[PDB]
């Protein structure tokens, strides 16, 4: 219908190989932060059949047992037997970690007052918020994440014991335009692909995915006779995890954020401490966007920020309200200037970014969940 459009977002499960890497990178970050709140961490993870490799740079006073940290993260995910394609007990864990470059350290944080630390890199970052859900996230991505979480729940509780940890989901919603804001109308298409054991047949899987997964997550009001279902569309997914597809940290950046809505500056979150603005400034930009929506200044908003390595203040700040505010971009920028300080050395304090809660962010999206500091709106003064 006129004034409507489709939008699609995807999500992946905890055992998707890229997501395994994000979770391991953040388990390593958390392990360091538990002993050294000021650890400098830049931990990439790579996963392929039988292998977890850590590559990157860490300067920290912590004593971390990488073998134990990696294996415990893989155990949590559920890869605990060679029949599943990967086993935390018996996989190879390889470590290629060096200190942070002294050239970066001297230009970013050495001999600097914490509030005045430089950005750990240049880059651009965006924050986004939409009033279409209470949590201020797009419905497409929320539903896609919840479908993966449901698969993991039914795997872990033994309801569907043929499930394995690697999964992907995709949701297409038809939206109505509403003066710049968007209103979900119906779910147009759902995709679910999930790794499974050798014994279960396709019909049993398709029936369970519709009845026990989709119906348990997606409100019936969004589903109708025209909704298209692609359930196990490849027909067979026994080989999975890193054995089926090499994974890397920071290869699910759109799943981690807004499912394609808003915008993205390209930076990966996992495996990085607060001085890496790819993460901290994106979290702060989400916090600003959500504060503008919860504060009633707009219904839908996009915030861009950018930095130069070694420089504390952002180089640029931009706000686009999609036509959903009575205030101009200039007025919203002035409100943001009066209420937020987007230097990394201040974001760390406001968002408590030395706390070891990062592994919890590394599956099911970094935003719209669990009342993390960047999800608690700031009361705005103007």
Ligand X SMILES: C[S@@+](CC[C@H](N)C(=O)[O-])C[C@H]1O[C@@H](n2cnc3c(N)ncnc32)[C@H](O)[C@@H]1O
User: Interface residues with ligand X (CB under 6 A)?
Assistant: 16-17, 42, 57, 100-101, 103-104, 107, 120-121, 166, 168, 193, 234, 236-237, 240, 244-245, 276, 309
Provide the b/e sequence for 355-377 (b: ≥16 CB within 10 Å): ebebbebbbbbbbbbeebbbbeb
Is position 57 annotated in a ligand binding site?
yes
Among its own copies, ligand U7X, ligand X, none, the one that 150 touches (CB under a kind-dependent 5 to 8 A) is: none
**44, 121, 131, 273: which is the annotated catalytic residue?**
44
Stretch of 39-47, 198-206, 254-262, 359-367 contacting ligand U7X, by CB under 6 A: 254-262
189 near ligand U7X, judged by CB under 6 A: no
213 near its own copies, judged by CB under 8 A: no
53 near its own copies, judged by CB under 8 A: yes
Question: Cβ neighbours of residue 239 under 8 Å, at least 6 residues apart?
Answer: 85, 195
CA 174, CA 1: separation in Å to the nearest integer? Answer: 10
Q: Kindly write out the interface string for residues 221-260 of this chain, putting x where it contacts its own copies by CB under 8 A and - elsewhere.
A: -------x-x--xxxxxxx---xxxx-xxxxxxxx----x
CB closer to ligand U7X, 264 vs 378: 264
Is position 251 annotated in a ligand binding site?
yes
> What would the two tokens of residue 145 be?
């994440």
Question: Cβ neighbours of residue 28 under 8 Å, at least 6 residues apart?
Answer: 41, 43, 45, 54, 58, 64, 66, 69, 70, 271
CB of 360 to its own copies, least distance (A): 21
Q: Choose among 103, 127, 106: nearest CA to 117.
A: 106
CA distances from 105 to 109, 110, 346 (A): 6, 6, 19
CB of 150 to ligand U7X, least distance (A): 26
H-type alpha helices, the chain: 17-35, 66-77, 102-108, 139-156, 202-208, 215-217, 277-294, 329-339, 344-350
Q: Choose among 73, 61, 96, 63: nearest CA to 27.
A: 73
**10, 18, 256, 375: which is the annotated catalytic residue?**
18
Among 88, 274, 283, 320, binds its own copies (CB under 8 A): 320
Residue 47 bears catalytic tag: no
Q: Are strands 92-98 and 247-248 parallel, antiparallel or unpaired?
A: unpaired
180 near ligand U7X, judged by CB under 6 A: yes
**109, 252, 286, 294: which is the annotated catalytic residue?**
252
Binding site for ligand U7X (CB under 6 A): 5, 7, 177, 179-180, 182, 260-263, 302, 304, 318, 320, 329
């Amino acid at each position: 219908e006129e004034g409507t459009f489709l939008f699609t977002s995807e999500s992946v499960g905890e055992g998707h190989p890229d997501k395994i890497c994000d979770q391991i990178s953040d388990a390593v970050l958390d392990a360091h932060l538990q002993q050294d709140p000021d650890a400098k961490v830049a931990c990439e993870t790579v996963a392929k059949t039988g292998m977890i490799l850590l590559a990157g740079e860490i300067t920290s006073r912590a004593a971390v047992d990488y073998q134990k940290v990696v294996r415990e993260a893989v155990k949590h995910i559920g890869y605990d037997d060679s029949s599943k394609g990967f086993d935390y007990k018996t996989c190879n864990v390889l470590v290629a970690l060096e200190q942070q470059s002294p050239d970066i350290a001297q230009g970013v944080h050495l001999d600097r007052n914490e509030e005045d630390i430089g950005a750990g890199d240049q880059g651009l970052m965006f924050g986004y918020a939409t009033d279409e859900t209470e949590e201020c996230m797009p419905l497409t991505i929320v539903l896609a994440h919840k479908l993966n979480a449901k698969l993991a729940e039914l795997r872990r509780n033994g309801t569907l014991p043929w499930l394995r940890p690697d999964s992907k989901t995709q949701v297409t919603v038809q939206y109505m335009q509403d003066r710049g804001a968007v209103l979900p109308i119906r779910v147009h298409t759902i995709v679910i692909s999930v790794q499974h054991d050798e014994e279960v047949c396709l019909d049993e899987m398709r029936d369970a995915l519709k009845e026990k997964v989709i119906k348990a997550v997606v409100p019936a009001k969004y589903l109708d006779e025209d909704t298209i279902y692609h359930l196990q569309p490849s027909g067979r997914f026994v080989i999975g995890g890193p054995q089926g597809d090499a994974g890397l940290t920071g290869r699910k950046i759109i799943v981690d954020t807004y499912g394609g809505w808003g915008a993205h500056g390209g930076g990966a979150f996992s495996g990085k401490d607060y001085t890496k603005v790819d993460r901290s400034a994106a979290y702060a930009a989400r916090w600003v966007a959500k504060s503008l929506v919860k504060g009633g200044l707009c219904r839908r908003v996009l915030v861009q920020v950018s930095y130069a390595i070694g420089v504390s203040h952002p180089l640029s700040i931009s706000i686009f309200h999609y036509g959903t505010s009575q205030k101009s971009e200039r007025e919203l920028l002035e409100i943001v200037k009066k209420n937020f300080d987007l230097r990394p050395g201040v974001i760390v304090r406001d968002l408590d970014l030395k706390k070891p809660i990062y592994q919890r962010t590394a599956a099911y999206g970094h935003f719209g969940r669990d009342s993390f500091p960047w999800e608690v709106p700031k009361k705005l003064k103007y």
